[PDB]
Amino acid sequence: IVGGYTCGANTVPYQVSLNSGYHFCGGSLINSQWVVSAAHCYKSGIQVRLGEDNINVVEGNEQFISASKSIVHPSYNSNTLNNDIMLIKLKSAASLVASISLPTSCASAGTQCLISGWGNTKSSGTSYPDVLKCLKAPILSDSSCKSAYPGQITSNMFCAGYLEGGKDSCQGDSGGPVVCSGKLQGIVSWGSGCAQKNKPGVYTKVCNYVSWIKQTIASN
Amino acid sequence: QCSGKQEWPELVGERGSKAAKIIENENEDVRAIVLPEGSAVPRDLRCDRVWVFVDERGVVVDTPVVM
Ligand SMILES: [Ca+2]
């Protein structure tokens, strides 16, 4: 997260860290046994870390649980990142750290949201934080979004952030939450650089997938 | 903390395809991915990936790093 602020411990209880030896992506806990992340975060042998604040210091709220399976969306396109959504089942249920509710309707442009993660904090150069970082940012008009990334935005994506640059998600934030008024509306997905002018963040549109999520959980 | 060589300042100004080979030789745990400068990219964090951004002449435009 660049241009953000220190969330503070347990202020984002649904935030998850995906760890394969190192933190590589984020995720959102949607119930005691299931995490929502990005399809491009898929790998085998994911360990899910809940209740994290400082990912480099055990502080007391951590629950590290193996992923028993990771279901990538059937129509995920690894090249264009369309349908960039993945479900991870925990090997054992987490102790409820709390889940975030799914959306019942899509949010509109201009809506203020909370984006968070342990991603790089620099637009230029590199700095990876120990503690969880947060950013408040508005959803942008589908018009702005498409103009920023011509030929690349699908109906399953939205832009959020600041066209003037300086505040954005970044490498290490993928899979993580975009929450707007208590609902998970987005998944950190892609962008050109981080916090560059006219290059806002692009996010998976979670409201398009509520049905797939339910059905997938029920059959797995 | 990733493993092996992490950054290639010497490769700025070099041909992309040539830099990619050098990178992969000097750190056997990464794959080099040549992309046009300004290409959008996923926002995951990896210890096995090195983007190599090139201008329209295929010249390395910034320091490749593991990320
Ligand atoms: Ca910790």
Author numbering:
A (entry chain A): 19 to 114, 118 to 241
B (entry chain C): 3 to 69
What do the study authors state?
Recently, attentions have been drawn to another member of the potato inhibitor I family from buckwheat seeds, BWI-1 (Buckwheat Inhibitor 1). Interestingly, BWI-1 has an uncommon binding loop sequence with a Pro at the P2 position and Trp at the P8′ position, suggesting a unique mode of intramolecular interactions between the binding loop and the protein core. Here, we report the crystal structure of rBTI at 1.84 Å resolution and the structure of rBTI-trypsin complex at 2.26 Å resolution. Within the loop, the P1 residue, Arg45, is an ideal substrate of trypsin, which ensures the inhibitor's tight binding to trypsin.
The structure of bovine trypsin in complex with rBTI aligns well with other trypsin structures deposited in the PDB database. Trypsin-bound rBTI has an overall structure similar to that of free rBTI, with both consisting of one α-helix and a central parallel β-sheet. By superposing trypsin-bound rBTI over free rBTI, we found that the Arg45 at the P1 position was buried deeply into the binding pocket of trypsin, leading to a small but noticeable shift of the binding loop towards trypsin (RMSD 0.26 Å). This movement disrupts several hydrogen bonds between the binding loop and protein core, indicating that a significant conformational change of the binding loop occurs upon binding to trypsin. When rBTI binds to trypsin, its P1 residue fits into trypsin's binding pocket and forms hydrogen bonds with trypsin residues. Because of this tight binding, the binding loop of rBTI is pulled towards trypsin slightly, which shifts the P2 and P1′ residues further from the protein core and causes a rupture of the hydrogen bonds around the water molecule, leading to the dissociation of this water molecule. As a consequence, the binding loop of rBTI cannot maintain a stable conformation and risks being hydrolyzed by trypsin, similarly to a regular substrate. To counteract with this situation, rBTI employs a local conformational change mechanism: the Trp53 at the P8′ position undergoes a rotameric switch, with its indole ring flipping upwards and occupying the original position of the water molecule. In this new conformation, Trp53 forms a stable cation-π interaction (examined by the CaPTURE program) with Arg51 at the P6′ site and interacts with hydrophobic residues from the binding loop, thereby stabilizing the binding loop.
